[PDB]
């Protein structure tokens, strides 16, 4: 819980699991990694007083989902935004200092309600912490925003990520 | 609303725009495309009797998402199966014949309980249509579930996807 904010390079250096060490929390690699930066991250504030982060990713046109999504009407999708706020969540967890490997549980209401073309500059992420456990399963859950240039656009709750030591029971 | 079944040759035809026609709904393609075929389509059946589409991805060792979700603990992104499922449902509100282009606008309740390894063959996706308003919006209410070789996995309830013959609203 000691560092409260992450650079792109400390973000890859945990997807190749050396931010958290052997069997613990890695973040996706590009391109499914979805956040450039963690600008802050704490344990303590947020909406529930449990802990929040803030991080974005920049945007330009050259992203690989905006030609793929959709043929001449690119936009970056949805479910990538989403998956920024359980690959932030999942952080959360490991920076807490938990071990084990991530999966995403799961979400309560996911709402989009604006979008993210390729004149963007930069996504932000907002994500507030309601509850972590560690006794027995390691898991948290939390409501998150994303916004694009000071507009908020997507909404989530009841974010759901688990840390797991082994995954064969999935 | 004629044809019930789609191989992967008319799903990417509907990625360019060239099922449903221009400025109507299409596909994602590759890399973001998650549905290879859709075995059935109809606008009866299913759990509320309104619709229900089967659809199927084939799953081998070398699809992208594996190499970087995660280096060393493959598995298929959470984010990509729900986007299936969306991808599904806007295929659905296109192929009932409504014009504009698709966008995904959330879900209630959201499981992951399962997961794809690289070594799974098949994905099957069951998507039931619950609502669909076609007039003023175009908008579909839908359940859905992925399985993975006859196993349950996954689940989203009350997805939602509307149709939009201008996107500027968002
Ligand atoms: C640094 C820590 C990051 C952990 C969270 C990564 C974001 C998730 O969306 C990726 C999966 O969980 S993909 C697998 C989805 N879940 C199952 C049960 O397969
Ligand atoms: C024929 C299939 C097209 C309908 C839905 C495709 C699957 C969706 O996940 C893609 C988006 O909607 S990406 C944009 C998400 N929504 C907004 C408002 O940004």
Known sequence: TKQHAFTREDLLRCSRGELFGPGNAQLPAPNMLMIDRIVHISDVGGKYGKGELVAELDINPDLWFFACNFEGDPVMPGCLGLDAMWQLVGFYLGWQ??????????????????????????????????????????????????????????????????????????
Chains 1, 2 share one sequence.
């Open 97 to 170: 200092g938990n071990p084990g490997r991530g999966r995403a549980l799961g979400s309560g209401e996911v709402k989009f309600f604006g979008q993210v073309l390729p004149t963007a500059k930069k996504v932000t992420y907002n994500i507030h912490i309601k509850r972590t456990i560690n006794r027995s399963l390691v898991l948290a859950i939390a409501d998150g925003t994303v916004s694009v240039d000071g507009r908020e656009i997507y909404s989530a709750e009841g974010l759901r990520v688990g840390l797991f030591t082994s995954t064969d029971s999935f």
